[PDB]
Write an enzyme that holds these catalytic residues in place. Structure first.
Site, mmCIF file in Angstrom:
data_model
loop_
_atom_site.group_PDB
_atom_site.id
_atom_site.type_symbol
_atom_site.label_atom_id
_atom_site.label_comp_id
_atom_site.label_asym_id
_atom_site.label_seq_id
_atom_site.Cartn_x
_atom_site.Cartn_y
_atom_site.Cartn_z
ATOM 1 N N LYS E 159 0.820 -1.207 0.000
ATOM 2 C CA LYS E 159 0.000 0.000 0.000
ATOM 3 C C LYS E 159 0.857 1.261 0.000
ATOM 4 O O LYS E 159 0.557 2.221 -0.718
ATOM 5 C CB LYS E 159 -0.945 0.000 1.195
ATOM 6 C CG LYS E 159 -1.935 -1.128 1.177
ATOM 7 C CD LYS E 159 -2.884 -1.066 2.353
ATOM 8 C CE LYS E 159 -2.173 -1.170 3.685
ATOM 9 N NZ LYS E 159 -1.516 -2.484 3.870
ATOM 10 N N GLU E 185 1.148 5.303 10.426
ATOM 11 C CA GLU E 185 2.040 4.847 9.375
ATOM 12 C C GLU E 185 3.479 4.813 9.881
ATOM 13 O O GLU E 185 3.850 5.511 10.827
ATOM 14 C CB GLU E 185 1.915 5.766 8.158
ATOM 15 C CG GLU E 185 2.816 5.449 6.976
ATOM 16 C CD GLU E 185 3.249 6.693 6.227
ATOM 17 O OE1 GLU E 185 3.289 6.652 4.980
ATOM 18 O OE2 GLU E 185 3.555 7.711 6.881
ATOM 19 N N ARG E 186 4.286 3.984 9.231
ATOM 20 C CA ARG E 186 5.697 3.880 9.565
ATOM 21 C C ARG E 186 6.377 5.235 9.437
ATOM 22 O O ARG E 186 6.053 6.033 8.554
ATOM 23 C CB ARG E 186 6.369 2.877 8.640
ATOM 24 C CG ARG E 186 5.593 1.594 8.441
ATOM 25 C CD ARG E 186 6.463 0.525 7.832
ATOM 26 N NE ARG E 186 5.888 -0.040 6.621
ATOM 27 C CZ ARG E 186 4.705 -0.634 6.550
ATOM 28 N NH1 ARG E 186 3.944 -0.761 7.623
ATOM 29 N NH2 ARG E 186 4.288 -1.112 5.395
#
Ligand SMILES: Nc1ncnc2c1ncn2[C@@H]1O[C@H](COP(=O)(O)OP(=O)(O)OP(=O)(O)O)[C@@H](O)[C@H]1O
Ligand SMILES: [Mg+2]
Lengths: 329, 50, 514, 464, 464, 50, 50
Positions: E159, E185-186
């Site tokens: 994604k 999110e990372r």
């Protein structure tokens, strides 16, 4: 045709928001006009008279078992009081409060003492050993019924003992002929401690040591009846809000007399004639003798507002302004 | 359909202008009407003559 | 404009009066996540509309020994501990009347389309009882959907309850919107016995999706007679919970007056998902899939309000087209299992059929209508009774498509027939067929005139034939329409004109026909 | 003296009573709803004692409009149905109130729906067979006098027609009575049933009790016991044999699970009530034969996920003794009553209960029809000519066998005008024995359709 | 006047206030932590009113070091973050504080994170197509300019690379303003995005708000709303068209599920909060575009356990116009970007909008691939030579369509070494029209893999 | 940022370290390699998954 | 005693499983229908036995 209806509905929305803003300005100007009108004392008198004449034209928390047991305990307190005297009631209330503290602290004892049984005799004996030397025998005679009866929760036994001590103190107040002064002072302190949220929240010290709250009451806040009641209540408060506790004290006082307290709001204190007319009208409406705790406030200018029980009958410039302002198209 | 859509957009712009002018004109009078409406509503809100 | 602007306010002022009447009071003790606990209100009744001072509403859905659990219908942020809660003397109630036709309304009958306020004709409680066994009538007259795959194989009679159960993006909304659009040819005739009215209850849709449906209906003129009850996902769980009952009340008013109504619930899965939120927040005990125990009683008491009334009650009807969103085609889940047992029929949409080019993607043979032929006009019974049999024989033979040359001739013919009937039931969206046209469409198939047309051309052949017959030989459609039977003489002339057309028709391969 | 409502949470209602007036559980209590649009005499069934004179109850009607503190009067008895010969011909709700004529039946004797099954010593020690007279039923799936029959029906496969047929059968051959327990009935099909039985004029021999889907799960649960109590009166007092229809039993289990969750009980396995088997037995252990008279039952049984291991169908199948299955694949041939001879089964079709000849004939019929059900694939894909002379010599018998399982039956008497036939058991056996051996190959298939036995077979064949 | 902490449990905190000073819901409260390196001012958001003047709040920042009895002051307003042209080119946290330049935004206009979505009157359905230059997207799941696009996908299926590629393709040429919400999110990919936007100089028109997963549930919840409120300012107050990217929106609900049980909400199904649909709708309805002012949303949705039946994705599906739908199956075959062409969908894919030339090819491709997935079970066991000639030709075409749908994405340089390609829409339609009709069956299966268009297809086929 | 999914069925059939090349991934990819490996292995994972 | 057999007035028996500080949760054997609030329960003096 979609365009034709679209332009018609744009016109309709234009006139609609026109009407809306015009009504808003109209109600705001009417608010200013009536707020100027409310300045005169004669106008306020007329408003309260109109509302009063219009009106003229017009234990719970406890569950079944605790409810019955408390009713029976009060029925026996009736027999105890029929022979009591002021000096004796003074000590009765204090000793009942002392045993209330004991049960509130020695929770292990209280859990056994509140055990629901019909053959409650052992519990009575447990009390007889433990208290017979500590407190006077009349208190034991009443705690015998307090223990023998059934309670839905271990909390309601303490609640019933506190309530009985409160009733004994109030009975001392009544026999001394201070029934009215004690109620007046209880409502005075109710409104005070509801308006002073710092000291009153500090009074709900059931996390802190109680004698500090007692000495704080003695320093800050008078008929000895009200002082004893407040000191006993803060000593047995058990996490309830102090203001809501004192107001419950006053409610219980007036209900013990047989009446009910109707809180009233108005712009200013009315003369004695208005008070007596209002009391008679409220008694007619609710079928009981009544007492009015006038919580006058300027924000609710004009008219007259009353709340009794869980019901209201409200007339004021502000409430009717809300009614007019919310009805705009 | 495109021709009628253009006609509809023209109707929409005509509406915009007509309603701006009408809104200004009618608010001019509404300013006056507001005084009497508020005077009467001052009586109705009070529940007595004022 | 100024005159009426001032006159409305003048009349409002004149009609204003004192609210002196005594009423009961409560106070909020807890508030969170859409629920508010109110102490007091001793005389409160279940489902009573409470009002909170910011102008907010509640339903009083739970009463305890000392507290009332009220779901908040909107603007929950404005609620606070200590707020004075007043009770209206009224259970949940919504306005109703013909003014709602063409409008979008929230589950309280308030307009949300931004147009003028709706002229209420009457007010109905959201929870009145359904018509009993003795008040109803047999479901004997059709609710034409204009979808060949439904009216011919899983018909809907007005008074029926038909489930559009399927996956996401499989044509559920498409099917129900076509059902709503098809009713215009009936509406344009002012006969209330033909004239169907519609209510599209949008539960948990996003605003632009409700707007897309509204545009699709306007493009088809359906807003003359269609109402939308819109609980967009923006709005509280209570609105999503009450939208179907609001739609059912709006429809029931028309039904008891003797009109015919079509209610589309889109989707009841989100109705259940909202009642689950309300129930878990109220600390009611949960059951399977975390739904409350009464989640069946939630939907049944809704769908069972769809009925056909006896002549003593004006003969009205309310036709339910509930939609449900299955997960991974699990029709065995809880809420699907409930509605499959509450509804009279099920039009199972499946994603594989949708991708295979079979749209509206109804999985015949699994889809059913317990009402059956009673929901069809005699012509459609006669013409389509063989369709289910032929398609079942094809559903068996399709495994032999690789070996069509070895297959026995008698069933080779059935395979070639089935492929063309499948192509015959394909239909593009927003193009519903009148019964007069789809009778002929199915007649082309079951009577074997398509047998020489190449499969890939069937869809166009039909689309051309009906265009010829519609324009040049209208007496055929007029006969089917006005007499509801495909008389022998009209059948013979129909065959004659079918062969008249089929000689000119040209297929992909340029070949001739017959 | 009376109680007060103190908590309302949907259909569940808690009632506080004085110390000495608490009702025993499963008692019926009445409460008021006075708000005009929803006015009702709300019925509550006591489910639990919460303690402190407070009883947890489940409502039989929508609680919308209930008020805290409203008076609740104990009736002193459980939900009680009117019982008698007068309930025949009428339709009732789960609480014993007539729909067709409100207030009817209130003068009759009232029997509490909660009553224990017959004592162990009163039960019959051996399984008697029910000579209903339908060829396929009597031969392939013999019913049990006092047993239960699953009925896997469907849309347009003749379920209602078989229901009418068995009603006529029991009412005319056995002189009995029928009770139709509509559990979770769709109101539409319930009215369809009412008007269809009124048209067939069998309503006069049937008592209908409809727990409609409109209602909270309390009544959808208790209606099966309501109907079974009408049947128990017809059995115990009037001495009739009875045929109790239940449609649908799975909805009885479902409503029980819903009530369990409402009352706060932890769910079992898949999500049913923990008392699942206990109350399913309370219902099923009560349908049995006593003192020479019995209640037979046909139970339409849903099977979720088509999983015959799910606790609900598994618990249902632990009781019922036979399985009749109707198939569209057979109805579409004109083979009424459309009982699928192969999917259907019975636990009595063993040579210990039925005679050895009966068992042998039924097993040979099943063998022939199994061969044909396997060969139909060849029949469709390759044609009959692809079969050998022996396989065709078999198919010719199989077609006529499956035809002869059809019967001109009293439910068809409404439309064909011809009277419905009752075929004795011995004649059915001695007909299918000869037919399987091939003694009627020379007759055309049309001779076997809708014919009532062997002498009627001859009457039709010799005239055709 | 001020309040005091009473109880602390995880990120949730309980705060007592005087009777009349209780703060409204969603107000921001400040409380000090005074230990060592953890010393900080702590923002809490009022989630609930618990009665007795208590209020339950979610800490936007870790509670470690927090002490019972510490003072808590209400802001008198909700959480507010800066809005204006000046926030473009800078990076913020959920609280609205700049990570790059502390104290930057404290003089901007501040907008409350919480606000109602636009009215249904302000909404119109969007129909303008957005050309991305990815074959699979532009053909089978075309995007809407002004609509709510999404990239569903399980863990690791790509994604983040796809969303960064969509940023590289849209936001580069897009003339308006862009916002990127990093929700759970990372951080590494957020920094790669920051430095890539800085290198491409797109950063001057991109406002980034990061609430990365190192952050507690409060900020993981409110970061989406904080980015969305900047997007809503650019929409409403300026009119300049907007792009709003969100990776990963699922975390917004997930964070709530972490606090729900602390907030005293009973859990629902597999373990989400009961408010799931209400929260997700209150967030998603705001992301919409009113008439005359667009927000082109592009939100990647995590799918737990790859189970598209999980309540969170199942509820998210409703709020979207175009749903690209990644799957681990396609990813395991190297068909990166890994879009499942049969799961993916778009509301714009109608001949009335995309044109019949596009719709025909898209539906033919979907039909071929659906038949291929239907035939894979047969192919895996029976074999390819056992199929019909037509099924076998369709299989050989489907295997090539699968690999031509794969594309060398620019953001996937590090995955492939080779540079990325953009394929115009006309060329995509032409190529897949040729494919479906067999004009490339003579090319090797490998020539289609990771190739940008027909010219590159030819060059690679002639390279094999 | 990546997966090395060790399948037991690959480990048993001699493929050890047993990385399931199809599901395994490193999303930093070439940036975590020296230029030589980016040359020789630039697409090895995709080739082995295919 | 724990697992003692308790008799309830309807002639009913129950097993004393959960001996709380002040209560005795029992599993009823037979017709729990006949059991209700306020009923006198008495000891058989026999552990669960036949
Ligand atoms: N009968 C049809 N013929 C051709 N295309 C169709 C048909 N029905 C639906 N579609 C296509 O399917 C999509 C619409 O699906 P639809 O909106 O009916 O799904 P849905 O059940 O509403 O899903 P959700 O409710 O989750 O949005 C559109 O792209 C539309 O073009
Ligand atoms: Mg839809």
């Amino acid at each position: 045709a979609q365009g034709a209806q679209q332009i018609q509905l744009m016109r309709q929305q234009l006139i609609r928001q026109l009407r809306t803003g015009l009504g808003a300005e109209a109600v705001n100007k009417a608010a200013e006009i009536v707020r100027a009108h409310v300045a005169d004392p004669q106008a306020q008198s007329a408003t309260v008279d109109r509302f009063l004449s219009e009106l003229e034209q017009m234990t719970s928390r406890l569950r079944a078992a605790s409810r019955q047991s408390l009713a029976a305990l009060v029925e026996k307190f009736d027999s105890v009081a029929g022979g009591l005297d002021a000096d004796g009631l003074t000590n009765l209330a204090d000793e009942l409060a002392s045993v209330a503290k004991l049960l509130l602290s020695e929770t292990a004892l209280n859990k056994h003492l509140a055990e629901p049984t019909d053959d409650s005799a052992p519990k009575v004996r447990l009390l007889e050993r433990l208290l017979s030397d500590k407190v006077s025998a009349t208190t034991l005679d009443l705690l015998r019924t307090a223990v023998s009866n059934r309670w839905s929760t271990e909390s309601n036994l303490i609640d019933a003992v506190e309530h009985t001590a409160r009733l004994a103190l109030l009975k001392r107040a009544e026999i001394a002929g201070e029934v009215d002064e004690v109620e007046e002072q209880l409502f005075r302190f109710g409104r005070v401690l509801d308006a002073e949220p710092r000291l009153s929240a500090l009074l709900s010290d059931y996390t802190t040591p109680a004698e500090g709250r007692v000495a704080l009451l003695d320093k800050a806040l008078v008929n000895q009846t009200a002082a004893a009641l407040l000191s006993q209540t803060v000593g047995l408060l058990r996490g309830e809000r102090a203001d809501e506790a004192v107001i419950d004290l006053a409610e219980l006082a007036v209900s013990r007399r047989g009446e009910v307290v109707a809180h009233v709001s108005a712009a200013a204190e009315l003369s004695d004639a208005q008070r007596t007319r209002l009391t008679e009208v409220l008694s007619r409406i609710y079928g009981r003798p009544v007492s009015v705790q006038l919580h006058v406030d300027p924000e609710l200018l004009g008219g007259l507002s009353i709340t009794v029980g869980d019901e209201v009958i409200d007339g004021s410039i502000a409430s009717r302004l809300a009614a007019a302002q919310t009805g705009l198209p | 359909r495109a021709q009628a859509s253009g006609e509809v957009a023209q109707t929409l712009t005509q509406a915009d202008q007509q309603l701006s002018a009408q809104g200004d004109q009618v608010r001019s009078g509404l300013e006056s009407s507001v005084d009497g409406l508020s005077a009467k509503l001052a009586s109705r809100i009070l529940g007595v003559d004022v | 404009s100024a005159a009426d602007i001032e006159g409305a306010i003048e009349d409002y002022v004149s009609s204003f009066s004192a609210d002196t009447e005594r009423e009961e009071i409560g106070t909020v003790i807890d508030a969170g996540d859409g629920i508010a606990h109110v102490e007091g209100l001793p005389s409160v009744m279940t489902q009573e509309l409470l009002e909170f001072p910011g102008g907010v509403l509640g339903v009083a859905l739970n009463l305890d020994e000392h507290s009332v659990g009220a779901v908040i219908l909107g603007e929950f942020e404005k609620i606070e501990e200590g707020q004075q809660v007043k009770r209206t003397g009224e259970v949940l109630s919504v306005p109703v009347g013909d003014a709602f036709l063409g409008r979008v309304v929230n589950p309280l009958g308030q307009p949300i389309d931004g147009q003028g306020d709706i002229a209420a004709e009457t007010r109905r409680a959201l929870e009145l009882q359904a018509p009993s066994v003795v008040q109803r009538q047999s479901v004997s007259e059709p609710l034409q959907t204009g979808i060949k795959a439904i009216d011919a194989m899983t018909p809907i009679g007005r008074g029926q309850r038909q489930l559009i159960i399927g996956d996401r993006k499989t044509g559920k909304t498409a099917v129900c919107v076509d059902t709503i659009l098809n009713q215009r040819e009936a509406w344009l005739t002012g006969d209330p016995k033909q004239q169907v009215r519609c209510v599209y209850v949008a539960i948990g849709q996003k605003g632009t999706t409700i707007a897309s449906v509204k545009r699709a209906l306007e493009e088809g003129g359906a807003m003359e007679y269609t109402t939308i009850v819109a609980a967009p996902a923006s709005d509280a769980a209570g609105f999503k919970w009450l939208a179907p009952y609001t739609g059912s009340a709006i429809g029931q008013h028309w039904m008891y007056n003797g009109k015919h109504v079509l209610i589309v619930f889109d989707d009841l899965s989100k109705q259940a998902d909202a009642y689950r939120a309300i129930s878990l927040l109220l600390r009611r005990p949960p059951g399977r899939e975390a739904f409350p125990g009464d989640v069946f009683y939630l939907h049944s008491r809704l769908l069972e309000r769809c009925a056909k009334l006896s002549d003593e009650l004006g003969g009205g009807s309310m036709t339910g087209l509930p939609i449900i969103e299955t997960k991974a085609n699990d029709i065995s889940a809880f809420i699907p299992t409930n509605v499959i047992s509450i509804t009279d029929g099920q039009c199972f949409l499946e994603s594989d059929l949708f991708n295979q080019g079979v749209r509206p993607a109804i999985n015949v043979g699994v889809s059913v209508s317990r009402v059956g032929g009673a929901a069809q006009i005699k012509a459609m019974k006669e013409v389509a009774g063989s369709l289910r049999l032929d398609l079942s024989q094809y559903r068996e033979l399709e495994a032999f498509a690789a070996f069509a040359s070895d297959l026995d001739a008698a069933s080779k013919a059935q395979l070639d027939r089935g492929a063309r009937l499948v192509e015959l039931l394909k239909q593009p969206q927003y193009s519903p067929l009148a019964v007069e046209e789809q009778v002929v469409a199915i007649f082309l198939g079951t009577q074997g005139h398509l047998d020489s047309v190449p499969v890939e051309d069937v869809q166009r052949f039909e689309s051309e034939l009906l265009e010829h017959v519609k324009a040049s030989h209208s007496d055929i459609f007029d006969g089917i329409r006005e007499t509801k039977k495909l008389s022998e003489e009209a059948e013979e002339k129909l065959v004659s004109v079918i062969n008249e057309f089929k000689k000119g028709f040209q297929a992909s391969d340029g070949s001739s026909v017959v | 003296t009376a109680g007060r409502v103190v908590r309302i949470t949907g259909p569940v209602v808690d009632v506080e009573f004085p110390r000495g007036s608490v009702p025993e559980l499963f008692n019926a209590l009445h409460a008021e709803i006075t708000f005009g649009a929803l006015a009702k005499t709300l019925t509550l069934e006591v489910a639990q004692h919460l303690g402190d004179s407070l009883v947890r109850c489940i409502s039989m009607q929508p609680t919308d409009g209930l008020v805290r503190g409203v008076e609740v009067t104990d009736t002193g008895a459980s939900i009680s149905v009117p019982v008698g010969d007068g309930v025949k011909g009428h339709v009732f709700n789960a609480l014993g109130d007539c729909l067709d004529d409100p207030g009817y039946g209130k003068d009759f004797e009232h029997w509490s729906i909660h009553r224990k099954p017959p004592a162990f010593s009163d039960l019959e020690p051996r399984t008697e067979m029910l000579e209903t007279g339908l060829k396929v039923v009597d031969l392939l799936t013999p019913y049990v006098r006092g047993g239960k029959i699953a009925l896997f029906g469907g849309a347009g496969v003749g379920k209602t027609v078989l229901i009418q047929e068995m009603i006529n059968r029991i009412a005319r051959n056995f002189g009995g009575t029928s009770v139709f327990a509509g559990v979770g009935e769709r109101t539409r099909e319930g009215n369809d049933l009412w008007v269809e039985l009124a048209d067939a004029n069998v309503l006069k021999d049937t008592a209908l009790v409809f727990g409609q889907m409109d209602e909270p799960p309390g009544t959808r649960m208790r209606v099966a016991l309501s109907a079974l109590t009408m049947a128990e009166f017809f059995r115990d007092e009037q001495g009739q044999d009875v045929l109790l229809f239940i449609d649908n039993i799975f909805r009885f289990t479902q409503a029980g699970s819903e009530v369990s969750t409402l009352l706060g009980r932890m769910p079992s396995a898949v999500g049913y009530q923990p008392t699942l088997a206990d109350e399913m037995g309370e219902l099923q252990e009560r349908i049995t034969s006593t003192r020479g008279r019995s209640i037979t039952s046909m139970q339409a049984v849903y099977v979720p996920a088509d999983d015959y291991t799910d606790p609900a169908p598994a618990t249902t199948f632990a009781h019922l003794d036979a399985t009749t299955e109707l198939s569209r694949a057979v109805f579409s041939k004109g083979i009424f009553p459309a009982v699928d001879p192969l999917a259907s089964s019975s636990t009595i079709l063993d040579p210990a209960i039925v005679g050895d000849e009966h068992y042998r004939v039924a097993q040979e019929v099943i063998r022939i029809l199994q061969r044909y059900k396997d060969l139909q694939d060849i029949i469709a894909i390759l044609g009959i000519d692809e079969l050998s002379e022996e396989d065709k010599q078999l198919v010719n018998r199989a077609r006529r066998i499956e035809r002869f399982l059809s019967q001109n039956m009293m439910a068809a008497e409404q439309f064909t005008g011809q009277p419905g036939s009752t075929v004795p058991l011995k004649e059915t056996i001695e007909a299918f024995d000869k037919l399987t051996k091939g003694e009627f190959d020379h007759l055309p298939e049309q001779a076997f359709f809708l014919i009532g036995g062997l002498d009627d077979l001859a009457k039709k064949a010799e005239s055709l």
